[PDB]
Amino acid sequence: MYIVVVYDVGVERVNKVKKFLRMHLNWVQNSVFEGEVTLAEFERIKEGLKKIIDENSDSVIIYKLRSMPPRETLGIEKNPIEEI
């Protein structure tokens, strides 16, 4: 899979999700990560995120894609496509 991960997390866990996702996926916007993973990394990422998360005040959408998607970007880009 290639995933894009976008989350809405409270200030008490938001620093934790960022540090965790940044060791599996590329950071491209605030609250948004993407990259290639395997089913190992995937459910590692996924449960790894559930442990971190209060599933009762917090939301993660992980879009499960074939491959890296084309995109378009308005405004202050934070991570040039090349770097991802």
Residue 10 contacts its own copies per CB under 8 A: no
Q: Distance between CA 43 and CA 56 in Å, rounded?
A: 20
User: Which one of 39, 56, 82, 83 is in contact with its own copies (CB under 8 A)?
Assistant: 56
54 makes contact with its own copies (CB under 8 A): yes
Tell me: is residue 58 an annotated ligand-binding position: no
We find the least distance from the C-beta atom of residue 28 to Cl ion, in angstroms, to be 8
Give buried/exposed letters for 6-33 (b at 16+ CB in 10 A, else e): ebebeeebbeebeebbeebbbbbeeebb
Which residue in the set 40, 76, 80, 82 belongs to the binding site for its own copies (CB under 8 A)?
76
